[PDB]
Amino acid sequence: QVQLVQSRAEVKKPGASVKVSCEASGYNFVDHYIHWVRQAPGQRPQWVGWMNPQWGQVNYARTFQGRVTMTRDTSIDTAYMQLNRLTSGDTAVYYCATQVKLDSSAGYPFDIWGQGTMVTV
Amino acid sequence: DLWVTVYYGVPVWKEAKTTLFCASDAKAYDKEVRNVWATHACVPTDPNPQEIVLENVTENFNMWKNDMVDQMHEDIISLWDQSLKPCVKLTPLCVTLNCKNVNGEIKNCSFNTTTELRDKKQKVYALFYKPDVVPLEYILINCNSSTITQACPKVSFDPIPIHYCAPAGYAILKCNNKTFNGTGPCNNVSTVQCTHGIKPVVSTQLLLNGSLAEEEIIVRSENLTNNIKTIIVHLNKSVEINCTRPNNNTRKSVRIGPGQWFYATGEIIGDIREAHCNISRETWNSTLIQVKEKLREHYNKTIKFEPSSGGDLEVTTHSFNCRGEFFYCNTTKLFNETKLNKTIILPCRIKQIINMWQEVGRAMYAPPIEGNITCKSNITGLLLTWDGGENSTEGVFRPGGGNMKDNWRSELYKYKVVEIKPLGVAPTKCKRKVVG
Amino acid sequence: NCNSSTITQACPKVSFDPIPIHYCAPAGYAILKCNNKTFNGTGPCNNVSTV
Amino acid sequence: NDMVDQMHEDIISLWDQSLKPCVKLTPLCVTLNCKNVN
Amino acid sequence: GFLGAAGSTMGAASMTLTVQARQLLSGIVQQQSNLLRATVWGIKQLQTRVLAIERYLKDQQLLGLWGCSGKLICCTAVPWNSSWSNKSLGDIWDNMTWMQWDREISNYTNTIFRLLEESQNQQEKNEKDLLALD
Amino acid sequence: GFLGAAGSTMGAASMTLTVQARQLLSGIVQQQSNLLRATVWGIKQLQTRVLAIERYLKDQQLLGLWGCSGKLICCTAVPWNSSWSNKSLGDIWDNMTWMQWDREISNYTNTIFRLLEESQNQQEKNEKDLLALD
Amino acid sequence: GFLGAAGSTMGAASMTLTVQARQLLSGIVQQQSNLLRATVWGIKQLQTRVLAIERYLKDQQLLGLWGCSGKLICCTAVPWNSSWSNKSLGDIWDNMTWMQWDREISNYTNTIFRLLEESQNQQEKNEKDLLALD
Amino acid sequence: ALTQPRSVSGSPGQSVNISCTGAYSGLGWYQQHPGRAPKLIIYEVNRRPSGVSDRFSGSKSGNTASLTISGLRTEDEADYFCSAFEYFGEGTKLTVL
Ligand SMILES: *[C@@H]1O[C@H](CO)[C@@H](O[C@@H]2O[C@H](CO)[C@@H](O[C@@H]3O[C@H](CO[C@H]4O[C@H](CO)[C@@H](O)[C@H](O)[C@@H]4O)[C@@H](O)[C@H](O[C@H]4O[C@H](CO)[C@@H](O)[C@H](O)[C@@H]4O)[C@@H]3O)[C@H](O)[C@H]2NC(C)=O)[C@H](O)[C@H]1NC(C)=O
Ligand SMILES: *[C@@H]1O[C@H](CO)[C@@H](O[C@@H]2O[C@H](CO)[C@@H](O)[C@H](O)[C@H]2NC(C)=O)[C@H](O)[C@H]1NC(C)=O
Ligand SMILES: *[C@@H]1O[C@H](CO)[C@@H](O[C@@H]2O[C@H](CO)[C@@H](O)[C@H](O)[C@H]2NC(C)=O)[C@H](O)[C@H]1NC(C)=O
Ligand SMILES: *[C@@H]1O[C@H](CO)[C@@H](O[C@@H]2O[C@H](CO)[C@@H](O)[C@H](O)[C@H]2NC(C)=O)[C@H](O)[C@H]1NC(C)=O
Ligand SMILES: *[C@@H]1O[C@H](CO)[C@@H](O[C@@H]2O[C@H](CO)[C@@H](O)[C@H](O)[C@H]2NC(C)=O)[C@H](O)[C@H]1NC(C)=O
Ligand SMILES: *[C@@H]1O[C@H](CO)[C@@H](O[C@@H]2O[C@H](CO)[C@@H](O)[C@H](O)[C@H]2NC(C)=O)[C@H](O)[C@H]1NC(C)=O
Ligand SMILES: *[C@@H]1O[C@H](CO)[C@@H](O[C@@H]2O[C@H](CO)[C@@H](O)[C@H](O)[C@H]2NC(C)=O)[C@H](O)[C@H]1NC(C)=O
Ligand SMILES: *[C@@H]1O[C@H](CO)[C@@H](O[C@@H]2O[C@H](CO)[C@@H](O)[C@H](O)[C@H]2NC(C)=O)[C@H](O)[C@H]1NC(C)=O
Ligand SMILES: *[C@@H]1O[C@H](CO)[C@@H](O)[C@H](O)[C@H]1NC(C)=O
Ligand SMILES: *[C@@H]1O[C@H](CO)[C@@H](O)[C@H](O)[C@H]1NC(C)=O
Ligand SMILES: *[C@@H]1O[C@H](CO)[C@@H](O)[C@H](O)[C@H]1NC(C)=O
Ligand SMILES: *[C@@H]1O[C@H](CO)[C@@H](O)[C@H](O)[C@H]1NC(C)=O
Ligand SMILES: *[C@@H]1O[C@H](CO)[C@@H](O)[C@H](O)[C@H]1NC(C)=O
Ligand SMILES: *[C@@H]1O[C@H](CO)[C@@H](O)[C@H](O)[C@H]1NC(C)=O
Ligand SMILES: *[C@@H]1O[C@H](CO)[C@@H](O)[C@H](O)[C@H]1NC(C)=O
Ligand SMILES: *[C@@H]1O[C@H](CO)[C@@H](O)[C@H](O)[C@H]1NC(C)=O
Ligand SMILES: *[C@@H]1O[C@H](CO)[C@@H](O)[C@H](O)[C@H]1NC(C)=O
């Protein structure tokens, strides 16, 4: 209950697109924002963006702008993140993050994280 | 000696929340079942509001922890469902549409409906807009998610000013600071009977039809520097928009049941013309400048702009209601440049089946309005979101309208509900007459 | 009238026999009953009774 | 007199409230094949 | 006006306590239902009207159990235990507002309210019964 | 009975004021909810019960702020300004009814009601506080 | 606690009448609506709060018409007619409970309640008006 | 511009103590167990979320976040990340002898 479950790990070719889903169960999926954050194996974790499931309202860092699109399916409580124009430097593990069981309304930091999806291109 | 002495009616209050009360202006000119915000039982307000200014008092405010904006968003949702409860269902309209184009943004679709007789079937035609129809040979946009209850043509969506008024024994504290936080202490507070004229508009990225500022533009957020919450840029002056739907649409009545009449768009006459809005060019040019000055006070470098990256159609565009028809205006012409009458024109597309609040349930079908449509947007605020992690050389403010409580926080930032505790104990040199 | 509005039949359990009902003003109010034998309606009543 | 406005509003309200749980005759609005008795 | 003297000194504020006293219940000058038209607003309104009676009647009930029902200012014969506040007369009535007073003694007000019901009005009435016995 | 002396002289009517005072609220002899059944009548009934308490509590509140809470007849020390009415004692209490009295002074009753709360009970209590100081 | 002395003697029970008096209305410590959620329970709850006001306000109204509004114990000057009860002082206050008293005199309490409003407070006020005339 | 050291020494019974400087530094600290996702141990530099032991605590300064863990165990060997809003620190690996 109140967990984030992601998809299987994927390895793709440069130029191809990958889709990292993150289903949510046991809590109000719509009311809480879904953040997406990276961690390269041997580098600091890099923050991609957030996506609240009301309308989608996607926000991106400039290093991913024009390459990542996050969509959703609120009928089945699933949060997506699709990367386009994959390169050699886009290898990391991709985490979906949120904030549910905290008393801070500031939106940061995150407490509930996904199972992990190691993406190596 | 010092004996207690209780005083009834002391001016002390506590931070506590209660349920408010609608009180519209003395404007019972109805003549029809209308005013979905006021409805049938919102009382007239005080003709002479007793605004009471206080002194020597500084009370802290918190417009993001305010419970009035949670109660307002619950009522407007409740009024939205209550007004649609006796309205006409569109259950028999969820059939396979036979849609052919007109040329455009309108398809003529011929469908099958039952008549008032349960056995006879009729085939009628109706103009449906492009984003109201999903491919299947077509169907309506969300007949395979939830039901559709069309808006009753008798009622009106024009937002009249409603005053939320605390009951007897409570009070509403109004901050009078010309340049004020949002959250923080206010040097000039005033208790009032209740609030000013609040128009419960629905709008994304652009706060229409509200209250202006007095001195200058105030930029408001929880703490601004956080990128997760929207920034409410409360304007000083108001730019002028002339929105229109400059094509002649005829209203066609389709028989779908006993008393249930389905008002669709009949034959279009005149010119096939796009709906557009004239948000000046000169007043907006000075407006973004004055927005730049306030945004540069909270930073140290250039501040650029860029249109919305994504989301649903109702946040990427500028949504509002314009004489019973819901617009979706492309606000790329407003925010593109990187900041530090020759009017700009916004292509707006019209949708009828709108699912407001994104709650799984009733998604109303706005009936078409006969003739041309003209309204008057006014802009008393903006809704901006800061960008993510970048270099310090510049920052990007994408527009965006999130939860609808941000619309009410632009008008309920001044007010705060506190309970009055008139019992107070304070020592004095008085003692009552002894028994013995 | 099937092409104007719906029809909801009367439930056979209930009865349409009109029983005497008394419309009663609440506490704090009163009902003034005029007792003039030949009473016009509009106009003063010489003999009134609160009930 | 406002009592006759309030009474007439109640009898209308009692008329709609008593018919609210009653049986709808929506499927009876079909083509009737009627012949006379005499 | 209502809550007008919230920032004034206690001596100045104590003169216009009637103004704050009127507005806890009324109420009925602003509306009666209103029955001029005959919804979410109807249920919400009624619960406000019931609540305004609940808070008002508690205060007159507390004033009643302290034998102060009819009066806005009443003096008692329970002495002021110094542990509650150490401040003097001139440091309270001519230099402080009612807002800052409530903040400091709110911890022990409940047993002060217990002293008002036990120490005097429960003792005064038993003594007054024994006094009018003759 | 209730409103029985509405056409009698003020002296005769003033003796049976308790009867009109009783029936303003009750109320509870005729019903309590009623919980013997468990509708349009339910909502209609409840809004009347709230209104009956709310109107009743206004009058005891006004009597309370005039320091007359416990009494049906109370005398004051606000003098009668002659501009309100020029009639004498015998022209009022033994020749006129209450119904015709309310008709003529209703214009300034609110200012009179302002005199009852300010002139006496707001002055009497400050003086009475200053009187029991010693 | 509340109704704690229901089986004790009348003399012992008469000392802690404030405890039973507090609980007829409150009420508002346990809930106010509650506006923390925003059903069958909502309608049921509201009818309880209205009923709790209305019955409570009857008792202060009856105490008010007997000129005993502010007090929990008041003495009168209507004499006790012996036909109601023949028992003496020591047979009532130190050997009997309040329960068995209510069962035996409940038949004529209504004309006793008529004596409390007519015999004293309706006579005392007319005499008190005639007394402060000079 | 959020920096933290890579490895600081420690021993069971001796406190491991990490600096993290930067603008609005140390809003949240994460304990990434090797193999799975990180877990929040403190938020708002000092407050403690539910589900973590009492020995996990942090202290605040002007610009440096000091995370102090007392009473180490062998199961606490993990990677520690200092976070500030959307930014993140370099990462500090625990050293227990
Ligand atoms: C922000 O605030 C501005 C105000 O500055 C709003 O702009 C006004 O919006 C209202 C409501 O949409 C407009 O009022 C409507 O005007 C229609 C056109 O008026 C012309 O035609 C009528 C009839 O021929 C003439 O009487 C009139 O003088 C004009 O020549 C009316 O047709 C509408 O009438 C409604 O009620 C009647 C009576 O029941 C019905 O018969 C109609 O069918 C209709 O339902 C209505 O009066 C108004 O014109 C706008 N402009 C101004 C200057 O006030 C913005 O809408 C608001 N923004 C938002 C987002 O709410
Ligand atoms: C505190 O706020 C009140 C309310 O806004 C101010 O009162 C108004 O002041 C303006 C000019 O400042 C006048 O035009 C209005 O007529 C005033 N209102 C009334 C009802 O008289 C008040 O001046 C402010 N005081 C301070 C010190 O800021
Ligand atoms: C809507 O589509 C229908 C398709 O049948 C069109 O309706 C008919 O058009 C023909 C001309 O081609 C007319 O002779 C008929 O009288 C129309 N039918 C009716 C019921 O009027 C119609 O042209 C389309 N609407 C638009 C605006 O193009
Ligand atoms: C929007 O419309 C309004 C009026 O409908 C325009 O305002 C008037 O413009 C004319 C000339 O265009 C002036 O003579 C009037 O004095 C203006 N009146 C007011 C009240 O401003 C306005 O110019 C239009 N704006 C755009 C961008 O089209
Ligand atoms: C809003 O309008 C702008 C242009 O005014 C659109 O942006 C581009 O428009 C050109 C056509 O002139 C297209 O070829 C591009 O694909 C558009 N996008 C970009 C990123 O350049 C914009 O798409 C419009 N937005 C909406 C929601 O209609
Ligand atoms: C005024 O009207 C009342 C009510 O109709 C009359 O009182 C009743 O009528 C007859 C005739 O007097 C009596 O036999 C009844 O017993 C009366 N009822 C009661 C309860 O006493 C009354 O008589 C009328 N008076 C005048 C002067 O017309
Ligand atoms: C880490 O924890 C202890 C207690 O917090 C540290 O002791 C002080 O830490 C502050 C800031 O972390 C320094 O400014 C003081 O100089 C420290 N005092 C001493 C006496 O060291 C201590 O630095 C660390 N403990 C270790 C390294 O075992
Ligand atoms: C934004 O919110 C953060 C908390 O998420 C605030 O950060 C703390 O603020 C206090 C006092 O302002 C400082 O003592 C702390 O060191 C800050 N950081 C932490 C981690 O607690 C911050 O103040 C807010 N911004 C504004 C402008 O108020
Ligand atoms: C506020 O303070 C001033 C000066 O301290 C004082 O004269 C005034 O009476 C106070 N109260 C109000 C309501 O202005
Ligand atoms: C309407 O029903 C008839 C069946 O009688 C069918 O042939 C026709 O294709 C239907 N219309 C559409 C648009 O499918
Ligand atoms: C409803 O239909 C649309 C049409 O493409 C589809 O995308 C969506 O998944 C459907 N929803 C459900 C709940 O079946
Ligand atoms: C709010 O604005 C006031 C204006 O003086 C300022 O003191 C305070 O720091 C501001 N708070 C925030 C969180 O911006
Ligand atoms: C907007 O303002 C700037 C400087 O104030 C000016 O250079 C520019 O020409 C203005 N825009 C228009 C369309 O005149
Ligand atoms: C923004 O849009 C206007 C109008 O289309 C255009 O003239 C201008 O060059 C654009 N600015 C940028 C920076 O693209
Ligand atoms: C629209 O803005 C103008 C600015 O001149 C203002 O006069 C007018 O009152 C505004 N309309 C509304 C409805 O606020
Ligand atoms: C309903 O049917 C009757 C049958 O003759 C007809 O006269 C009447 O006009 C119909 N009503 C409508 C609204 O078409
Ligand atoms: C009833 O249905 C039958 C077949 O099910 C059909 O032949 C007949 O025409 C219908 N209508 C009548 C009997 O009015």
Residue numbers in the entry:
A (entry chain C): 1 to 121
B (entry chain I): 33 to 135, 152 to 184, 190 to 309, 312 to 321, 321A, 322 to 394, 409 to 504
C (entry chain G): 195 to 245
D (entry chain G): 98 to 135
E (entry chain A), F (entry chain B), G (entry chain M): 521 to 558, 569 to 664
H (entry chain F): 3 to 99
Task: Show sentences the authors wrote.
In the past decade, it was discovered that a subset of HIV-1–infected individuals produce potent and broadly neutralizing antibodies (bNAbs) that target the HIV-1 envelope protein (Env) (1–4), a trimeric spike of gp120-gp41 heterodimers on the viral surface. Members of the VRC01-class of CD4bs bNAbs, characterized by IGVH1-2*02 variable heavy (VH) gene segment use and an unusually short five-residue CDRL3 loop, have been isolated from many different donors and revealed to bind with a very similar orientation at the gp120 interface. Here, we describe antibody BG24, a VRC01-class bNAb, that targets the CD4bs with comparable neutralization breadth and potency to VRC01 while exhibiting half as many somatic mutations. The existence of moderately mutated CD4-binding site (CD4bs) bNAbs such as BG24 provides a simpler blueprint for CD4bs antibody induction by a vaccine, raising the prospect that such an induction might be feasible with a germline-targeting approach.
